[PDB]
Each structure stands twice: as structure tokens, then as C-alpha cells.
């Protein structure tokens, strides 16, 4: 997360860490949507152009975390994956259309003050909350900034980072990139002359872009950090996998499996 700040403890109890077991590596973010299911981006699990294709045994999930640098035994929960489900029409070769995947835990995880599921929006929530100017929140342990060389590497925080960002109007999202955008994504971020800055970044993929509903004051996951060109670049915006748009697939998966 770029230009965000340290999260308050338990401020994002649905936050999940997708972790490569060996060689150890924090791969991406993810979100808890029930005691057995975790939502993340497809490209974190499968992305041929980078020789990425992780199977269940290569990974684990770390839930309830605050600091990345140590195992937090009183709040943290580690889960083995029983099965990964990438969206069958996940378009990796072109524009990450439908960048979404589900991971079923082998066992249900117990909830606590630090582990709690986020809500998925229904048609109207999507319709009423996804408006230009409305702000959502993005969290993660990804990089703090775009670096001058890909090799510079990773500048990661120790504590979960949070940043609030405004949804931008589709014509602007479209004109901002040459990548073909689709109705299954939306973009968020401040415009060049809005002053404020902030964006998600490498390592944030799969994390939730949540919104608090003014009607029932529950938190809804409207997006999934998916892609962007650089991080926090002017006239550039982060892109998120539109969750309501892919909700029928999510429900079919959950109702058919586990």
C-alpha cells in the first residue's frame, strides 16, 4: 500500500495473507468470506507469463494478523488449503478480466476479535455504493512505493497498511490505460489535481477494497486488488476485480463445493 498508514488492531479482521511455504514468501492478500472460504485474485495463483501456477500444497493462509514480521500466536490462525478454484474465464493473457479465485480451507476457522468475515455485496449495494467520488478502503502488506528498478525489490511494512480511495468515473478509468478494461473491473484513486495520493501496489493483489454501508453499517467487499501500471503514478489508477459482477460464479462454487 502506497501513502497509507498503520492499521489499528483488528480494523480489518477479514484480512488474509496468502503465503508460499517454500521458499517462504508473503505472496498476496486475500479476504475471509466465511469460516471455510477465502477470496483472492486469480493471478496470485496462476499467471503463466511469470511462470506462476501454485497448487494447494505450495501454500498456506495466515488469518488474523497485524504484524507481518513475527508469528502472533494469540491471534493468528494458519490454514491448510483443501482446494483452489480459479475462475474458468480468467483472462490472464490479455487484461486480467475476471481476476478472481476462491480457496476452500480444509477445516473451518473459528472467529474471534481478530478473525471475522467481510460481507459480499448484492446487486443494489453494488449499484448504490459504486459511485464516482465515493471512497473505499484497501489494506495489505504489499510494497510501500513503486521503485526505480524492478530489481530494487520489496519495501514492505511490518504492520498492515490501510488507505482510503475514491472510485473514479469509468470514462476516466478507460482513458487512463491502454489495457482493455471490462465491466468486471473498476478503478479507484485520486486524480492529478485532487492533492491526496495513495494506491495499492505489488503484493497487495487479492486484498479487499471494502466499503462501509451507511444503511446497516456493515463492511462490504466491493473489490479485489487486481492490477495497475506502476504504483501511485499521476493520471494512473488502481484496478479492482468487481466482486458483485462475479458473484454468481462465487455462489456456484460455494454451493457446489464444500
Amino acid at each position: 500500500i502506497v501513502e497509507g498508514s498503520d492499521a489499528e488492531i483488528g480494523m480489518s479482521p477479514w484480512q488474509v495473507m496468502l503465503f508460499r511455504k517454500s521458499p517462504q514468501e508473503l505472496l498476496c492478500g486475500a479476504s475471509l468470506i466465511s469460516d471455510r472460504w477465502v477470496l483472492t485474485a486469480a493471478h496470485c495463483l496462476l499467471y503463466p507469463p511469470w511462470d506462476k501456477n501454485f497448487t494447494e500444497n505450495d501454500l498456506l493462509v495466515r488469518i488474523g494478523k497485524h504484524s507481518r514480521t513475527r508469528y502472533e500466536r494469540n491471534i493468528e490462525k494458519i490454514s491448510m488449503l483443501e482446494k483452489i478454484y480459479i475462475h474458468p474465464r480468467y483472462n490472464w493473457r490479455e487484461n486480467l478480466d475476471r481476476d478472481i479465485a476462491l480457496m476452500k480451507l480444509k477445516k473451518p476457522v473459528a472467529f474471534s476479535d481478530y478473525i471475522h468475515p467481510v460481507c459480499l455485496p448484492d446487486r443494489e449495494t453494488a449499484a448504490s455504493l459504486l459511485q464516482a467520488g465515493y471512497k473505499g478502503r484497501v489494506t495489505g502488506w504489499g510494497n510501500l512505493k513503486e521503485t526505480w528498478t524492478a530489481n530494487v525489490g520489496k519495501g514492505q511494512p511490518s504492520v498492515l497498511q490501510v488507505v482510503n480511495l475514491p472510485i473514479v468515473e469509468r470514462p476516466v478509468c478507460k482513458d487512463s490505460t491502454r489495457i482493455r478494461i471490462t465491466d468486471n473491473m473498476f478503478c479507484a484513486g485520486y486524480k492529478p489535481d485532487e492533492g491526496k495520493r495513495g494506491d495499492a501496489c505489488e503484493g497487495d493483489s487479492g486484498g479487499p477494497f471494502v466499503m462501509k454501508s451507511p444503511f446497516n453499517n456493515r463492511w462490504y467487499q466491493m473489490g479485489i486488488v487486481s492490477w495497475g501500471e506502476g504504483c501511485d503514478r499521476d493520471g494512473k489508477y488502481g484496478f479492482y476485480t468487481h466482486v458483485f459482477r462475479l458473484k454468481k460464479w462465487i455462489q456456484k462454487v460455494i454451493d457446489q463445493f464444500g
Binding site: 517462504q24 500466536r73 494469540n74 480444509k106 526505480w148 530494487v152 519495501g155 506502476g230
Partner: protein, 282 residues
Amino acid sequence: MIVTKDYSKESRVNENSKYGTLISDWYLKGRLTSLESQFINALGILETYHYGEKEYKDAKDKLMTRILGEDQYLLERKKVQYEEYKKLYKKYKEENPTSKVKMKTFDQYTIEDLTMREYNELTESLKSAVKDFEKDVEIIENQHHDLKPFTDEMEEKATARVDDLANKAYSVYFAFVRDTQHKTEALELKAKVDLVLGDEDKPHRISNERIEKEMIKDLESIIEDFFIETGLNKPDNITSYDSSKHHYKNHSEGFEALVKETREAVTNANDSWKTKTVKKYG
């Protein structure tokens, strides 16, 4: 738009340095690689496991602030230069219309202008930042004895206590990994033990009293997690797993005896251990 003037101020590079004498492209490549290595080294120090304690947070934020600041300096220099490169490219195409050479993208582009003044200032700023970090750390450790680095002998002894405990955990794991009823808990046990120890070829060093204390409580809690979740009782005695004696394939006979002995010990264990767990269950 109306142009954008200034660079970010976190960098210690002198404003006028970039307008000095540019270095020859052939020599430039090696200076950029040197810079890249310096950042990699600075970030790696920052990430060192030993420093993952709350007491180093400020010292780290401070170093991170300095490293990102010099990185941002180079990033902004690249953006300014890319903007000029594009205009040069278009002038070039107007002069060589039959040319089929394509304009590099920002990501394929690399810095073309650097002066020795910028190189030395970037280099010194990072060196300075690392030195300040090293001083801040020494101070932190004078104020917190359990954070002070062990002598090699003390680390070896502590590391062995930790490894012995982890090996007891591995035995439990091997004793239940072929047991349909508790296989998942066993698999998670192994994965959790591996996670805290770190990669087998470069494990987290038990470099001070705090790591030893916490790594031990973590491992003991992870073992206790297995017994809490499977509903089995933790035996007072568990033979530590020793590859040279119990390897599944290399020493099948020994592997089976370990499994057999561990399972039998679990069967004979009572529940007294629940009153003494590291974690609060329920």
C-alpha cells in the same frame, strides 16, 4: 500541465547535482547497477529477522524513509528523462521516417543521465542512513538486554534448544500424518513449525534472548494447538525426530518405531497439560 516543478524533498541529493557533467553511457551502466545493489543491501538489512521486534520499529521506519527517499529521487529522474526521450524519439522519427525502431515503454526505458555528483551523493546518503540505523540499533539493544545479540556460543546453544523442540513437534507430525482422523491437524502442525523456523537452508537465527524465549513459546504453543484441536493429550515425553535414525525412507524400521512410540505415549497421556498451556484456549 502547466509543468510541475519540484522533486520530493526526502532525498539528500543536491538539487544542482543532476545538472552537472553527465557520465558516458558505457560507464553509466555500472553506476546504476551499483546503485541498485546498494538499495538491495539497505533493504535487506532492514528486513533482517532479528529486527522484527516492536522496539526497532522507529529505527526501521526512519531507515525505510531514507531508502525510499533516495529511490524516489531516481524514480523521479527517470520520469523526467523518459519525458525528454519521448520527444527525442519523435524528432528522430521525423528525421528517419523509414525507421521501424519502436519507442521504449517507461518500463523498458532506463536512466540515461546521471552525474558523478548524484552517484556519490546517493551513495553517501544511503551509507549515512545505514550507519544511523546501526547506531539506533545499538542504543535499542543497550536499553533492552533481551535484544542484545548472543555470542556465537550462546546462539548455538539457544538454536539447539529450539531445534530440539521443533523435532519433538516433527515426531508428533509423523505420528499422525497417516492417521485419517488427525491428518489435517498434523499437516498444519508441520506447516506451522516450518513457518516459524523459516526456510531450512536459511532459518531464522535465534540471535538473542528474546527470540529464544518467544520461538520456544511459539513452538510449544503450536504443539499444544495440535493436541487442543485433535482432542488428544500431550505426552510429557516425546522422542525428538532425528533424520539419521528415523527417516521415513532411509530408516523405515526406525521411523515406524518412532511413530509407534509417540502414538502410544499420546494414548497413555492424561489431560494435566491443559492447565499449563502457553495460549488461552476458550
